[PDB]
Amino acid sequence: GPGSLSNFANVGVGTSSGKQKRYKFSASEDEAIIKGLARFTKGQQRFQQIYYAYRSVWHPARTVSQLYDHWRGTLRYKVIQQQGYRGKNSVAARSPEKASNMENNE
């Protein structure tokens, strides 16, 4: 059966050296919104209000739009645009990107 199981070896206590004071909640943000919307929602827009209330677990700042983004993708479950996963294991590395600004050929 599934569970912890683990081995009979000594573990003691964990210890990491490198980055500190880093949030990167394991998607705990969505959990904060659900708890906020399930506890308080007295307003024409509990989503934006709740976001500003729990603002601290992710990033203390205006981002109601982003809220609707995670709230829109969470409320639903029908999307096949994003695929592949290799940015969450142990090491965090950056990567380049693309951006169209000036592309002339004539």
Asked if residues 95 and 101 have their Cβ atoms less than 8 Å apart, the reply is no
Asked if residues 40 and 46 have their Cβ atoms less than 8 Å apart, the reply is yes
The coordinates were experimentally obtained by NMR
Task: For residues 64 and 28, give the distance between their C-alpha atoms in angstroms, rounded to a whole number.
Answer: 17
Query: Could you tell me how far CA 53 lies from the centroid of its own chain?
Result: 17
Q: How far apart are the first and last CA of the chain?
A: 65
- Percent of residues in the chain assigned helix, strand, coil, to nearest 5: 30, 0, 70
Q: Give residue 78's identity as a one-letter amino acid code.
A: K
